[model samples]
Target: LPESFDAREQWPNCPTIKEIRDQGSCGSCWAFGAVEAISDRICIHSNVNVEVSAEDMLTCCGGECGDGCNGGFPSGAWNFWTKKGLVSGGLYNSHVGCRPYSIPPCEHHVNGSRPPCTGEGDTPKCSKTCEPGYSPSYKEDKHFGCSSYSVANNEKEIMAEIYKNGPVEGAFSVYSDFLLYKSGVYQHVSGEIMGGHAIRILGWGVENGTPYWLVGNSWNTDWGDNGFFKILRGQDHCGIESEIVAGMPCT
Candidate 1:
């Protein structure tokens, strides 16, 4: 294994590995993080880039998935993927898939070109039909997962998973100081516990003697390091290593 690894660099043909999504003001990072990782896994496994619909998972999933935009379970997302499946969808207004994201991108930070997020809107309407002219019918567009499992909470094991597959969905307790992150490996310094936040861990590397996990968030590209951040690794910082989840695509 190399001392440093990046999924985007490993699988250049899999476009979703490098993509950054926005959860807007919603607390649906659970859905965005899971779907983003799934989308990349699909491409890595099937050699075909396809966007998994975050809208479908966010709104359509039942109580087992928890409240839609208000908050939800990361495990539920993967379970729904394997049991019920998801349709194709892309970013806001992308119109390239069955169901594009309903929420528009907004600035999640104090300074950005996008308008400040007013507030998290209600869970989007659950729609069974595809957008008006999409080629595939809703039923036909569905993509299913093969299985889901948690990677053992060990540094090398977690590293091996992403190194072998693509990316995995991970969650951590976000501290107040996390909002001000700019670059380099991040460790909680001083701040109140904000809440739990989900993200995709796509790679890992050491920087200036600090080991870090390369994580992608759903706060738009303006937040963090172009929508990605490096968190301290190996110490299970913020429980980021505890509940890592990943699965195979039904390719």
Candidate 2:
């Protein structure tokens, strides 16, 4: 594997959308983000530059993990790719607009079911209530919860892996400090930060001899340089290092 890779080369001439419609009140960001990366990779791999639908991954990929809009892990998504296949059918309308539905097409199997997440600030509960044929041995650590040192190590490891393996899914905790990242270099700010998770690690780059990682976000172009953000390499922001994982297709 190459020691480093350029995302722009892989996604050359790819247009970045403003803001991907949100999945309001639903804990499917993991699926949305994971599929987004998959879609980009598929497009790059196929030389087809088109957006893929996250809803397809969410509805279809469910049950493999656990149920609707609950929660899911990045690795579980990779497992989904191994079992079922993901189609590049384009992005669906906003989830908020398509609420009150619970079936396929909308419920197409992406990989795993929704995880058990507490509504809002409550602590999340671990549950294995899933259908038959589904593996109940799934754990959050398989998706999240790597040690800080492990996370940092994985950053380098995954960088090499993705450089060879292609686009991979990356999860990160988005605190309020991230909200302050308006433009230019990203520096942490002091304040009460809300803990929300997002996915997107396009590739790595260096600025002024300082190593940084490139990530795509769904907050729209107005948020941070057209839905892209960067973080300083080796900076353990709220254990951010521990949250890195690669999404690979199992064949």
Pick by TM-score: which candidate is best? 1
Candidate 2 runs further than 4 Å off: 1-5, 13-25, 44-50, 63-70, 92-152, 247-251
Give candidate 1's error at residue 26 in angstroms.
0.9
lDDT at residue 21 of model 1 (Cα atoms): 95
Model 1: ten consecutive residues of lowest lDDT = 112-121
Q: 144-205 in candidate 1: lDDT tens per residue?
A: 99998888899999999999988999999998999889899999989999888989999999
- Which of the numbered candidates is closest to the native, going by highest lDDT? 1
Residue pairs with clashing backbones, model 1: none
TM-score for every candidate vs. truth? 0.97, 0.63
Candidate 2 residue-wise lDDT at 197? 62
